[PDB]
Each structure stands twice: as structure tokens, then as C-alpha cells.
Design a protein around this ligand. Structure first.
Ligand SMILES: CNC(=O)c1cnn2c(O)cc(-c3ccccc3)nc12
Ligand SMILES: [Zn+2]
Length: 348
């Protein structure tokens, strides 16, 4: 039974126009900020990284909340893996000379200048109302409705770090040909500190590869281009994302589900895609059965405390050090109740 699932997808489709207009406001303000940022010597090669839920056509809800990524090409860089983390690194070289705190590029000094130019650029913009919310990377408020989370990401056209070597298991699904082509693409580093925290580390980002895989997702090149070749991959991800957002909303006044994100759902989704490489395993008629494997796999990750990063196999997103067992058990309790009662949180 996919009735309640198909119902939700129709309601989610109704949010498309509001999200689209709101994205229009954000594209306006962001194109402006990038024009002003490009003036500074350090942020010369700055550009918009067209990655995220919106460009991947999976932005389910919240038109008043957008995340934007700013790429900055860095020339010949050297990475030093921090404390065997496989995801966190120090950026060494091998225009950013001003931000070097030794031989290591400072995340803090880099972000400070970024925050400084952005702060300076939002007072000069009078056309639309734009306010900047203080740091607690950079958050804007367009008109007085839309919030924009702005992330800075370094771009490296180098070969991917060794920790990714056994990641991106798309060979039997998307082909080895595609895996070779994808790994030839750059890789990003977002400033994220790691526990000790180490406020000088950078985390690996493959937002662009997630987009490529989501927007060209079948074994067949003509997947979702004809009546006979329609699949339910994207619809399963949209439903998983919506399941977490609804439960997170239902229990906001509890605080358990705070540490869970759409990235956990997306990672689990790519794992299920690897397990079911055939387009025939994703038939539109089988949506109920397909979403049930997604729910089921996700629950196994919660129980076993094992959700490996799709690109970095050794990095566990569901580690006890990141999410406490009692929180995973609450999320399990709720998802199982929902599945058992024909998803009451959907019509909610
Ligand atoms: C909770 N995670 C997120 O919200 C989130 C969003 N993008 N992204 C991402 O591009 C990478 C990772 C990540 C987190 C830990 C270790 C390895 C990779 N996380 C994210
Ligand atoms: Zn498809």
C-alpha cells in the first residue's frame, strides 16, 4: 500500500511554487554577494556551488530556510589527516597567505574575513531587505522571512584523499566508467571543527557528487524519461526526508531528534541504492515496498549504531561519540510506531 505515500508526494508538490519564488530571492542576493566578494584578493576565484536539496529537486519543505555553498579554488594544496578521523584535515601548502597560522591555513581567520566582507556587503544592498544574524557559518535574513545559511568550501582539483579510496560503491549500479569520471572531479573542504574542539580542521564535502548521482540516478541512461522507465528512487528519499522532518517537528519540545539530519537519511538512501542497483528494483508500482526497505535499512543503522559515510567508509555518522544510544532508540521507537499505524505523522 502506497496510498498515504502518494498522498504526501502530492502535498509536497504543492510547496514547489513557494520554494521556487523564495529561491529566486536567494539567487538575487547571493549573485550580488559573489560579485562583491570577487573584488577581494583572497576571495577572487569565489563562486556558487550549485549543490543542495533544491538543485537535486529534493527540497521537501521550509521555503523560508535555504543553505548556500560558496566554492573557492585553492591551487596546489597538501592535506594532513587530523587524529585518524578520515574526514577531518589540516590545509597546508605546497592569495590566502594572510590566513596562515603557521604552515596551516586557519579556518577561523578565513571565516572571519568572509564574515567581514559579507557584513560589509549586506549594508550596501538597499534593493531588498537583508539582515545578517550573528555567529554561534554566515546566516542572512531576506526581507524578513527567508533565512540563508552560507557555507565557504575550498575547492581542490587534486586526487581524492586515501579515505575515499573504497567509497562511492556505484560500480554495479551507475557503472565503474561513471565512478572513474566522478572521482576525476574536484573535492571540497568545509570548515568544521572536530572533538578533543580542534578549531583549525576542515571536513570533506562531495555535495556535487551527491547531486550528480541524484540527478542521473538509474542503471539505464533513459531512467525516468519514459512511461515504461519511471522509478521511485527520488520519491523514497523525499518520503524519508519528510518522515524525519515531521517527527523532528512533532518532538521539538523533547530535544532527542535534534542531532539527526537529512544527511543521515540521504546517506542511508545511497546505501539502499547500492544494495538495489537495478531500475526494476525501483519500479513506480513498488513504491510501498521500496519505501519500506528504506525505513527498514534506516532502522537497522539506528539499532546497530552504524551509518557509514557513502564516500568515507571508515567515518560512522551514527557513532556513539556523535549520537547517544538513547536518542537512536527514541528515533527507532517513533519510526516503528509510524510504520505500524499507517504513518499518522504524514497527514499531520
Ligand atoms: C550531519 N551531517 C550534515 O548535516 C551534512 C551535510 N552535508 N554533509 C557533508 O557533505 C558531509 C558530512 C559528513 C559528516 C561527518 C563525516 C563525514 C562527512 N556531513 C554533512
Ligand atoms: Zn529513475
Amino acid at each position: 500500500g502506497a496510498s498515504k505515500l502518494r498522498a504526501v508526494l502530492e502535498k509536497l508538490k504543492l510547496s514547489r511554487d513557494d520554494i521556487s519564488t523564495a529561491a529566486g530571492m536567494v539567487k538575487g542576493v547571493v549573485d550580488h554577494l559573489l560579485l562583491r566578494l570577487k573584488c577581494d584578493s583572497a576571495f577572487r576565484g569565489v563562486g556558487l556551488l550549485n549543490t543542495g536539496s533544491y538543485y537535486e529537486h529534493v527540497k521537501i519543505s521550509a521555503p523560508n530556510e535555504f543553505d548556500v555553498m560558496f566554492k573557492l579554488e585553492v591551487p596546489r594544496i597538501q592535506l594532513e589527516e587530523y587524529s585518524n578521523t578520515r574526514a577531518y584535515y589540516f590545509v597546508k601548502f605546497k592569495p590566502l597567505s594572510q590566513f596562515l597560522e603557521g604552515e596551516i591555513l586557519s579556518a577561523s581567520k578565513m571565516l572571519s574575513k568572509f564574515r567581514k566582507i559579507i557584513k560589509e556587503e549586506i549594508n550596501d544592498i538597499k534593493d531588498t531587505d537583508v539582515i545578517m544574524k550573528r555567529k554561534r557559518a554566515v546566516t542572512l535574513l531576506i526581507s524578513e522571512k527567508i533565512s540563508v545559511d552560507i557555507t565557504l568550501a575550498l575547492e581542490s582539483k587534486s586526487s581524492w584523499p586515501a579515505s575515499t579510496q573504497e567509497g562511492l560503491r556505484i560500480q554495479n549500479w551507475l557503472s565503474a566508467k561513471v565512478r572513474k569520471q566522478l572521482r576525476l572531479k574536484p573535492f571540497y573542504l568545509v570548515p568544521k571543527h572536530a572533538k578533543e574542539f580542534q578549531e583549525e580542521t576542515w571536513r570533506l564535502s562531495f555535495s556535487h557528487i551527491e547531486k550528480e548521482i541524484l540527478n542521473n540516478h538509474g542503471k539505464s541512461k533513459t531512467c525516468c524519461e519514459n512511461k515504461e522507465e519511471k522509478c521511485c528512487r527520488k520519491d523514497c528519499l523525499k518520503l524519508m526526508k519528510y518522515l524525519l522532518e515531521q517527527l523532528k517537528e512533532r518532538f521539538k519540545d523533547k530535544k532527542h531528534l535534534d542531532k539527526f539530519s537529512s544527511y543521515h537519511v540521504k546517506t542511508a538512501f545511497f546505501h539502499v541504492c547500492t544494495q538495489n542497483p537495478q531500475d526494476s528494483q525501483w519500479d513506480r508500482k513498488d513504491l510501498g515496498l521500496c519505501f519500506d526497505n528504506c525505513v527498514t535499512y534506516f532502522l537497522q543503522c539506528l539499532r546497530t549504531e552504524k551509518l557509514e559515510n557513502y564516500f568515507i567508509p571508515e567515518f560512522n555518522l551514527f557513532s556513539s561519540n556523535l549520537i547517544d544510544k538513547r536518542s537512536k532508540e527514541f528515533l527507532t521507537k517513533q519510526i516503528e510506531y509510524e510504520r505500524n499505524n499507517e504513518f499518522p505523522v504524514f497527514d499531520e
